[PDB]
Amino acid sequence: QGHMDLICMYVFKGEESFGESIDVYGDYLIVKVGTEFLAVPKKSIKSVEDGRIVIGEFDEEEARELGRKWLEEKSKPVTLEELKSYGFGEEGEGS
């Protein structure tokens, strides 16, 4: 059960290459794009693929500002356990 490439799942905005999964906090997947961190909401993530994350649509400017709000709060020492998710999405590109 689960998927491969747990080290870094490639986040695709539908079909287009959006970014890469770097961090996960609360209800936001921190996606590293270009130079900055776009924190996409879980409602955007459609399906966890085998080493990929297909997301749909989301308010980019909002995900960007609460992304840099994460750049403020990340100053706290590493005890965030909510990042550690198994990837129970047995479905995806194949089964």
Coordinates of C-alpha atoms in Angstrom, one line a residue:
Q1 CA 0.0 0.0 0.0
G2 CA 1.1 3.6 -0.8
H3 CA 3.4 4.8 -3.7
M4 CA 7.1 5.2 -4.8
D5 CA 9.2 8.5 -5.0
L6 CA 8.3 9.5 -1.4
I7 CA 11.5 11.6 -1.4
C8 CA 9.9 14.3 -3.7
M9 CA 6.5 13.9 -5.5
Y10 CA 6.4 16.1 -8.6
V11 CA 3.4 18.5 -8.3
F12 CA 1.5 18.9 -11.6
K13 CA -1.2 21.7 -12.0
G14 CA -3.5 19.3 -14.0
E15 CA -1.1 18.5 -16.9
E16 CA 1.5 21.4 -16.5
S17 CA 4.6 20.9 -14.3
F18 CA 3.8 23.3 -11.3
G19 CA 6.6 22.4 -8.8
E20 CA 7.8 19.9 -6.3
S21 CA 6.6 18.7 -2.8
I22 CA 9.1 20.1 -0.2
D23 CA 7.0 20.4 3.0
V24 CA 3.4 19.8 4.4
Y25 CA 1.9 21.8 7.3
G26 CA -1.8 21.7 8.4
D27 CA -4.2 22.0 5.4
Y28 CA -1.4 23.2 3.0
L29 CA 1.1 21.3 0.8
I30 CA 4.2 23.5 0.6
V31 CA 5.1 23.3 -3.1
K32 CA 8.6 24.7 -4.0
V33 CA 8.1 26.8 -7.3
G34 CA 10.9 28.8 -9.0
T35 CA 12.5 30.6 -5.9
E36 CA 9.4 30.8 -3.5
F37 CA 7.0 28.4 -1.7
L38 CA 3.3 28.2 -3.0
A39 CA 1.3 26.5 -0.1
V40 CA -1.5 24.9 -2.1
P41 CA -4.8 23.8 -0.1
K42 CA -5.6 20.1 0.2
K43 CA -8.9 20.7 -1.8
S44 CA -6.6 21.5 -4.8
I45 CA -4.8 18.1 -4.6
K46 CA -6.9 15.8 -6.9
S47 CA -5.0 12.5 -6.7
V48 CA -1.6 11.3 -5.3
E49 CA 0.0 9.5 -8.3
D50 CA 3.0 7.1 -8.1
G51 CA 5.7 9.7 -7.2
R52 CA 3.5 12.7 -8.4
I53 CA 0.8 15.1 -7.0
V54 CA -1.9 16.1 -9.5
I55 CA -3.5 19.4 -8.2
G56 CA -6.3 21.2 -9.9
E57 CA -7.1 24.9 -9.3
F58 CA -6.6 27.2 -6.3
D59 CA -6.2 30.9 -5.4
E60 CA -2.5 31.3 -6.2
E61 CA -2.1 34.8 -4.7
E62 CA -3.6 33.5 -1.4
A63 CA -1.5 30.3 -1.4
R64 CA 1.5 32.7 -2.0
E65 CA 0.8 35.0 0.9
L66 CA 0.1 32.2 3.5
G67 CA 3.1 30.5 1.8
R68 CA 5.4 33.5 3.0
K69 CA 3.4 33.5 6.3
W70 CA 4.8 29.9 6.5
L71 CA 8.3 31.4 5.7
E72 CA 7.7 33.4 9.0
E73 CA 6.4 30.6 11.2
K74 CA 9.0 28.0 10.0
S75 CA 11.5 29.7 12.4
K76 CA 10.2 27.3 15.1
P77 CA 12.4 24.1 15.8
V78 CA 11.5 20.9 13.9
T79 CA 8.7 19.1 15.9
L80 CA 6.0 19.4 13.1
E81 CA 4.8 15.7 12.9
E82 CA 1.7 16.4 10.7
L83 CA 4.1 16.5 7.6
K84 CA 4.6 12.7 8.1
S85 CA 1.7 11.2 6.1
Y86 CA 1.8 7.6 4.9
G87 CA 0.3 8.4 1.4
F88 CA -2.7 6.1 1.9
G89 CA -4.0 7.0 -1.6
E90 CA -3.9 3.5 -3.0
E91 CA -5.6 4.9 -6.2
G92 CA -3.9 7.1 -8.8
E93 CA -2.5 6.8 -12.4
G94 CA -2.7 3.0 -11.8
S95 CA -3.5 0.2 -9.2

